[PDB]
From a paper:
We present the first high-resolution structure of the c14-ring of cF1FO from spinach solved to 2.3 Å resolution. The space group of the crystals was determined to be I121, with the cell lattice parameters of a = 93.14 Å, b = 96.34 Å, с = 158.68 Å, α = γ = 90° and β = 106.72°. The c14-ring asymmetric unit cell contains one ring with 14 c-subunits in each. It shows a network of hydrogen bonds between water molecules and amino acids showing intersubunit contacts that determine the angle between c1 subunits and therefore the number of subunits in the c-ring. Ser21 side chain is bonded to the backbone of neighbor c-subunit via water molecule Wat201. The additional electron densities form three circles parallel to membrane plane at different levels with the distance of about 5.4 Å between each circle, which corresponds to the average distance between the bulky hydrophobic amino acids of the internal α-helix of the c-subunit. We hypothesize that the densities originate from isoprenoid molecules (presumably quinone isoprenoids, such as coenzyme Q in mitochondria, plastoquinone in chloroplasts and menaquinone in bacteria).
The proton flow passing between the ring and a-subunit2,8 drives rotation of the c-ring.
Author numbering:
A (entry chain H), B (entry chain I), C (entry chain J), D (entry chain K), E (entry chain L), F (entry chain M), ...: 1 to 81
Amino acid sequence: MNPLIAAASVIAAGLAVGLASIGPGVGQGTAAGQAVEGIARQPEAEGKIRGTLLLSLAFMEALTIYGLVVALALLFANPFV
Amino acid sequence: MNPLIAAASVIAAGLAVGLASIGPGVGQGTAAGQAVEGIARQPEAEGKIRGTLLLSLAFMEALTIYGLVVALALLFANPFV
Amino acid sequence: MNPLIAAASVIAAGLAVGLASIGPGVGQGTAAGQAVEGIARQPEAEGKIRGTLLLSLAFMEALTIYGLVVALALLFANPFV
Amino acid sequence: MNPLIAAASVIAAGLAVGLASIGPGVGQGTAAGQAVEGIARQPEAEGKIRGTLLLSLAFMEALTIYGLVVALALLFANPFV
Amino acid sequence: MNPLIAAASVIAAGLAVGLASIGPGVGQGTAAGQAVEGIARQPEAEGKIRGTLLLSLAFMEALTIYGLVVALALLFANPFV
Amino acid sequence: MNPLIAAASVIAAGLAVGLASIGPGVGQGTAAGQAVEGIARQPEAEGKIRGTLLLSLAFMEALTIYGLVVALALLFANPFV
Amino acid sequence: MNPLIAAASVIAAGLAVGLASIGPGVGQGTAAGQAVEGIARQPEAEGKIRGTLLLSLAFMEALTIYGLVVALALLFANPFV
Amino acid sequence: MNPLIAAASVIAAGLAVGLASIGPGVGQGTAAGQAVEGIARQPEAEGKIRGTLLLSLAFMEALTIYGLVVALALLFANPFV
Amino acid sequence: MNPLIAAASVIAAGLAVGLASIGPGVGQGTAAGQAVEGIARQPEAEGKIRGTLLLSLAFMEALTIYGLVVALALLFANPFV
Amino acid sequence: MNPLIAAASVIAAGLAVGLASIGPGVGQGTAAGQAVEGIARQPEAEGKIRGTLLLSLAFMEALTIYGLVVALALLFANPFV
Amino acid sequence: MNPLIAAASVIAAGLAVGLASIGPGVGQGTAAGQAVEGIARQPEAEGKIRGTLLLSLAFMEALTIYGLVVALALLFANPFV
Amino acid sequence: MNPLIAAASVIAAGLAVGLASIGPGVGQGTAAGQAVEGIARQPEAEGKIRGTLLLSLAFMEALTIYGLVVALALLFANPFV
Amino acid sequence: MNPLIAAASVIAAGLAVGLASIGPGVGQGTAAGQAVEGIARQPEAEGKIRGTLLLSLAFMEALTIYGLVVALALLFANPFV
Amino acid sequence: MNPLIAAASVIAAGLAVGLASIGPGVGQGTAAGQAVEGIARQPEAEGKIRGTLLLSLAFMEALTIYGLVVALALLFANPFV
């Protein structure tokens, strides 16, 4: 009853943060890999490449942070428990 | 009964935000990777490349935000609890 | 009974929006990646490339929006609860 | 009992629209990606390429719409509830 | 009892239409992608390419339509409910 | 009891037609893709290519039709209900 | 009891025919794809290519037919019901 | 009890034949694909290529037949029912 | 109770033979594919290629036969039923 | 009751840290691999390459650390137990 | 009770031998494929290639045999039944 | 009750350490593979390559160690049992 | 009770040895394949190649042996039964 | 009670060691494969290549050993049984 909501909440938190890193994890690697390959091919373009990569890493990091925010909400701002 | 709806809601929220980052995570990486590869090959085209990438990252970020919106609705604007 | 329908509805909503971004997420990345690669190779064709990409991103975004619409219907226009 | 049909219906709706975007999502991206690559290689063929792509996107969009139609039928034209 | 058949039927309908688009979704994208690549390489062959593609898209669309037909039968021509 | 057979039958039908399109879906796309690529490379061989493709599409379509036949048998020629 | 065997039988039939097309579906596509690619490269070898392909398609079709045979046996020659 | 053995047996039969075609399905396609590619490249070697392919197809077909044999044994030579 | 051992045994048999063909199926195809590609490239080496392939097919066939042996033992030499 | 929340919490912790390393694990490898490939091709660019890689590894490491933080919170800062 | 151990044992045996062939199956194919490719490219190196392949096939076969040994132990040398 | 927390804890520990090696396992291999390829291509760059690889291996090893730490905490610093 | 521990132990043993061969199976194949490819390209390097391969096969074999050791411990050195 | 903890512990041990070899198995193969390819291309660099590979194999072996350590702890240093 009262325990079920809390039990469901902690499971939801684990799933939220756990699953949220799978896509962005693979994606950040793909971006970063082509970035350093680009720098090796065109060292003078490091600034342009690093700038575009950082922008990209931020967009992908945000995806996982949405998962963290929900997990933290389920633990420390839970409106049902 | 009353606990089951809340329990289901928090699980649904975790799933919504967790699953929603898998595709866009991989996708943003693919786009970002070819972007920095393009910049390395054609540094003078950085502006055009960064512009088209940012447009693409926004479309893909939105996919995951739909998941976040539903999760936030299930937690803080729940119509059944 | 009455709780089961609501419980099923919130789970369905989470699944609907969560699953709906997997394909379009990967797809938008593939399209966007080849778009910026194309711009790097042929900067003069940016307009034609961006036009075709935007059309494609819209078709793929719609796929996930169908998921969002059903999720929002299950939460805020539920005909069974 | 009476709630089981409605509960099954909302789950079915979520699955129908959620799963239906996975294939067409990936597919539309593949098509759109080769389309913009083609335009970059042969800008004079934009019309032919855009025409064939649009035809293809429609065929793939329909696949997911079948899922949406069933989901909407399960929610708003349910013959068992 | 009477509810179980209806409950099973709506789940079956969702699965039928949902799963049926995964393969044809990916397939149509592969075909369409090589079609527009072919048009870019050989614009004079557009007619032959579009003809063969359309034939292929129809064969693949049919695969998913079999799923839709069964789903519609389970909802609106159910012989057990 | 009596409802279980009908309930199992509709689930079996959904699975049969749903799963049966996954392989042939991907396969038809692979075949069709190389077909249009071949036509672009060798337009004079369209007839030979279209002939072999049609034969191949039929073999792959049959795979999914076996699924449809079983589904239709489970719904409209069920020997247990 | 008596219903359980029939219920298990129809599920088994659906699984048998459904799963049996996944491998052969992908396989037939791979074979057919390289066949039409071969015809495009070497049109004079169409006969040899089509002959070897047909042999291959038969071997792969048989794999799925084993699934159909078991499904038909479970439905119409069931030794337990 | 008595029904459980028969129920388990039919499920086992479906799984046995269903799963047994996944690997050999993909494998036969890989072999057949490289065979027709080889014939296109070296038409004079058709006999040698077809001979080695047929040997390979037999070894892979046998893998799935082991599944069929067990399924047929579970249905028509069951020592427990 | 008493039926549980027999019920578990038939399920185990189905799983044993079903799963055992997945790896060797894919593997035999990979080996056979490169074998016929090798024969096309170097027809004079057919004997050496066929010899090494046959050795390899035997090692891979054995993997699945271990599954068949256990399945046959569970059905016809069961020490617990 | 009191045990269920603790039981759910430890499971959630395991899932959180376990799942959170899958994506970043693959991603860090992709980035690091292209980094050392880049250094081999352009040894003079080691500094630029190492700098961009380290930035990327930090972004990807953070993804998994979010999982660790939630796990540690569930164990040692649990607000429900 | 007494039946549960035997029931668990036969399931364990099926899983042990079934799962144990997946990796080695794919692996042996990869090794054998590059072996025959090598022989085609360098027929004079057949002896060296066959020797290294046989060593490799033995190491991979052993992986699956560990599964067979445990399965046979669970059936015919079970210390708990 | 008291056993459930301990039972959940040991399962969580197994999952934590088991799952945590999947990503970093694949990743470390990718990095190490390109490292030795780089050394072969540019032996004079061994030091730079080994330095960047070691940094990368540490970042990836840490991912799995987070899993080990949680597992060890669940076993030997469990705050709920 | 007493049967549950033994039942869990035999399942654990099957899983341990079954799952433990998946990675090392694929890995040994990758290593062995590049080894024989290397020998074909550089027959004079057979000794160096075979030596490094054997070292690698041992490291990968050990991974699966850890699984066998645990399985054998669960069967023949079980501390709970 | 006492049996549940022991039962959970042996399952956890099997999962821990079983799953822990999947990633490192694939990874070690990737590294070892490129190592022997490198030796074939640059036999004079064997020492440098073998050194970097061994370092890498150790890092990857450790990943699986963490799984073995937890499994051994669950069996022979269990703090709950």
